[PDB]
Amino acid sequence: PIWQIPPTPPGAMVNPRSPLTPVVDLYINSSWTTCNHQLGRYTIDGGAIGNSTFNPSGLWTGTFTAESGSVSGQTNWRIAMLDNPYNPTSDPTLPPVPRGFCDWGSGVKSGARQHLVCFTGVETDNGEGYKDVDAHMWDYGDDATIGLDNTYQRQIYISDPTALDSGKRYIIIPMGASGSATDDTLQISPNCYGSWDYAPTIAPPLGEQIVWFRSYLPASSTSASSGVNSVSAHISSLMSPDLIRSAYVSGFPEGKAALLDYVLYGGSVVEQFKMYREGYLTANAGFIIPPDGYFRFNSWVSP
Amino acid sequence: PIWQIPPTPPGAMVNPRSPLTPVVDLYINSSWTTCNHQLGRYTIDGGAIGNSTFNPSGLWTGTFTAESGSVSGQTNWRIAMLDNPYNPTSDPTLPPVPRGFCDWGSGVKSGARQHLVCFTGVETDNGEGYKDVDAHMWDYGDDATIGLDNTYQRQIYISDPTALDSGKRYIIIPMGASGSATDDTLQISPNCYGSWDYAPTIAPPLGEQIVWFRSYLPASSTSASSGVNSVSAHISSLMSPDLIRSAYVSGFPEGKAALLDYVLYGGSVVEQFKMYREGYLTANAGFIIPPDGYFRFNSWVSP
Ligand SMILES: CC(=O)N[C@H]1[C@@H](O[C@H]2[C@@H](O)[C@@H](CO)O[C@H](O)[C@@H]2O[C@@H]2O[C@@H](C)[C@@H](O)[C@@H](O)[C@@H]2O)O[C@H](CO)[C@H](O)[C@@H]1O
Numbered sequence: 001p002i003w004q005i006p007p008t009p010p011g012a013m014v015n016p017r018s019p020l021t022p023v024v025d026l027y028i029n030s031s032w033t034t035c036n037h038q039l040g041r042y043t044i045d046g047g048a049i050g051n052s053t054f055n056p057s058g059l060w061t062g063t064f065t066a067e068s069g070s071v072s073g074q075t076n077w078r079i080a081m082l083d084n085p086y087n088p089t090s091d092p093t094l095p096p097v098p099r100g101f102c103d104w105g106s107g108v109k110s111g112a113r114q115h116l117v118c119f120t121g122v123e124t125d126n127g128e129g130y131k132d133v134d135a136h137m138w139d140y141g142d143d144a145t146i147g148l149d150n151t152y153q154r155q156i157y158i159s160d161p162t163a164l165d166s167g168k169r170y171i172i173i174p175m176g177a178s179g180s181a182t183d184d185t186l187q188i189s190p191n192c193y194g195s196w197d198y199a200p201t202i203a204p205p206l207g208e209q210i211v212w213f214r215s216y217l218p219a220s221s222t223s224a225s226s227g228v229n230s231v232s233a234h235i236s237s238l239m240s241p242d243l244i245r246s247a248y249v250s251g252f253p254e255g256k257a258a259l260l261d262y263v264l265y266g267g268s269v270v271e272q273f274k275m276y277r278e279g280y281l282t283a284n285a286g287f288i289i290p291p292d293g294y295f296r297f298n299s300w301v302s303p
Numbered sequence: 304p305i306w307q308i309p310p311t312p313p314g315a316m317v318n319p320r321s322p323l324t325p326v327v328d329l330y331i332n333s334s335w336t337t338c339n340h341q342l343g344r345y346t347i348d349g350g351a352i353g354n355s356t357f358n359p360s361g362l363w364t365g366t367f368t369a370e371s372g373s374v375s376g377q378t379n380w381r382i383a384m385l386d387n388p389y390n391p392t393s394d395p396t397l398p399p400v401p402r403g404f405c406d407w408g409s410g411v412k413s414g415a416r417q418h419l420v421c422f423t424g425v426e427t428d429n430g431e432g433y434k435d436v437d438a439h440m441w442d443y444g445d446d447a448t449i450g451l452d453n454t455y456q457r458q459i460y461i462s463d464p465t466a467l468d469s470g471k472r473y474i475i476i477p478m479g480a481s482g483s484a485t486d487d488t489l490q491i492s493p494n495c496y497g498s499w500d501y502a503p504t505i506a507p508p509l510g511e512q513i514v515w516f517r518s519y520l521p522a523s524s525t526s527a528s529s530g531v532n533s534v535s536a537h538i539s540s541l542m543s544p545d546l547i548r549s550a551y552v553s554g555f556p557e558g559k560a561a562l563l564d565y566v567l568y569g570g571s572v573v574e575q576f577k578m579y580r581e582g583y584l585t586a587n588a589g590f591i592i593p594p595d596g597y598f599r600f601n602s603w604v605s606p
């Protein structure tokens with residue numbers, strides 16, 4: 001059975017790990033030989049494994065509740081707890097965090113060094129919406145204990161000169177990274193522990209690399225005393241749903257990979273890629289490929 | 304030529320007219336017998352007609368430039384021009400506004416009662432990104448001439464108590480509607496005319512209705528003397544790209560429509576819709592259908 005791939009350029013696809021920013025390049029790096037992400041992982045057989053979705057934009061915004069306190073030492077870091085509608089009762093066999101929430105990495109207990117940014121507003125006391133939405137810095141855990149600093153839990157802390165209102169609900173739309181956060185710290189993701197079904201960490205076969213659908217993430221700061229010192233950066237994914245949702249019509253034959261041709265201009269230059277059934281695609285071998293081109297189904301090869 | 308529709312529920316699809324908020328219902332109304340929208344227009348043959356796109360979230364954010372001026376009387380309304388990076392030659396045969404920008408209606412010669420809201424922030428001095436991004440009431444045109452009030456051009460006005468910086472670029476993320484905006488004023492789209500290729504206004508055959516893929520839009524206001532007075536509303540579309548993207552394997556036979564079965568409640572209940580070649584769906588001759596079901600291909604019928 002042959003596979004028909006529509007001629008959709010990579011520049012017209014969604015970025016699962018960072019919507020609202022179009023794809024700019026295809027990035028291959030020789031220093032990145034693993035992937036422990038939770039968003040953007042798909043499988044031919046199992047569908048959307050891990051904590052991903054087929055509607056990244058719909059589930060990108062979340063809500064949380066203040067807990068009337070602050071972390072020890074730093075009085076500006078108000079503690080708060082994420083709100084999860086998909087798992088009302090805290091059943092250990094289901095993921096704690098809401099579906100589709102971000103997982104960008106920040107550091108092994110990193111404070112002054114770097115943080116992340118978001119939009120945040122209190123409830124309107126009317127049930128209709130929110131008020132006074134502005135930028136703030138946030139992070140997972142409390143950056144004090146090793147057991148829950150990078151643990152992908154439902155407890156976070158947010159910087160605010162004033163004090164949060166206890167028992168009220170706030171909205172979160174995370175967009176930006178602050179402090180000293182480079183590309184490497186964002187590439188890695190916080191660890192996860194428990195008994196729920198989370199996506200494992202893959203590794204490429206010896207002698208191959210991985211495409212990363214790289215994008216560009218700009219900055220958003222605040223001109224005020226102790227404001228938000230943030231910087232521009234880049235963000236990467238593994239696979240977008242648009243490319244892989246086509247294969248469901250005719251699944252991969254047992255123990256077989258696909259050979260793909262990427263055509264840039266006319267027929268002058270053609271690149272050869274290999275797609276596996278576990279989600280990632282490889283390239284034999286470090287540079288950047290332009291995003292204007294179309295994919296082609298060549299043949300089936302053995303892994 | 305058979306059509307095989309994957310069992311994706313409508314609750315896991317994107318809303319072209321308003322990303323960042325999932326679809327909650329399927330809405331049919333007897334007072335809406337036309338559609339002059341510019342976002343969400345798709346066809347079997349021409350692909351994305353009008354100003355539509357297959358990546359709604361990528362092109363949702365825009366930018367504009369201030370012009371150092373104000374409308375007569377209401378100085379608070381500073382004029383500005385949208386920035387276009389696809390027709391950088393102001394060619395009349397190409398669309399003026401950028402792809403994927405908002406087209407919510409707000410009324411005719413009437414801005415002492417209603418307005419639209421957007422996240423606006425000024426540029427920094429390093430190219431890193433934007434800064435001090437906050438909510439701002441905005442609208443099309445200048446509310447003075449009949450030919451430039453609701454005309455879908457690249458000139459807008461934004462309310463700001465302070466003075467805008469001339470020649471600086473600002474970012475726009477439209478999210479919310481304020482004042483006295485109800486659902487009827489948002490359903491109608493601003494009129495467009497000229498020489499460029501725009502999408503026409505369709506009408507259903509007599510004896511049928513339209514399914515609208517409706518979604519809920521919350522409110523975001525500001526606590527200040529001349530602050531934002533936003534309201535909660537609903538936003539409807541015509542068709543999401545996920546449903547039409549599959550039909551491209553085998554196009555519809557000439558002069559023929561399709562019958563689709565909507566199966567909910569474990570099959571117990573099943574609805575019957577008719578899908579045409581232009582993009583819209585028709586239901587026999589007013590309520591809300593739940594969003595827990597999957598579409599099923601029944602057969603081909605004559606229109
Ligand atoms: C989260 C918080 O409350 N402060 C950030 C802030 O850094 C602070 C910090 O550097 C202290 C001393 O270390 O001095 C200032 O408060 C500083 O604020 C930042 O630096 C000044 C110069 C301004 O740029 C100000 O706008 C800015 O907020 O950011 C650093 C990043 O290194 C840390 O993240 C602190 O937690």
Ligand SMILES: CC(=O)N[C@H]1[C@@H](O[C@H]2[C@@H](O)[C@@H](CO)O[C@H](O)[C@@H]2O[C@@H]2O[C@@H](C)[C@@H](O)[C@@H](O)[C@@H]2O)O[C@H](CO)[C@H](O)[C@@H]1O
Pocket residue numbers: 379414415416417418440462482483527528529530531532
């Ligand atoms: C765009 C602008 O500057 N003002 C809006 C505002 O209405 C004004 C208006 O009603 C005038 C007199 O008509 O009186 C106030 O300024 C009023 O402001 C609004 O009402 C007060 C109580 C606050 O809520 C304020 O934040 C709010 O702006 O909204 C109306 C819609 O009714 C128009 O949009 C005006 O242009």
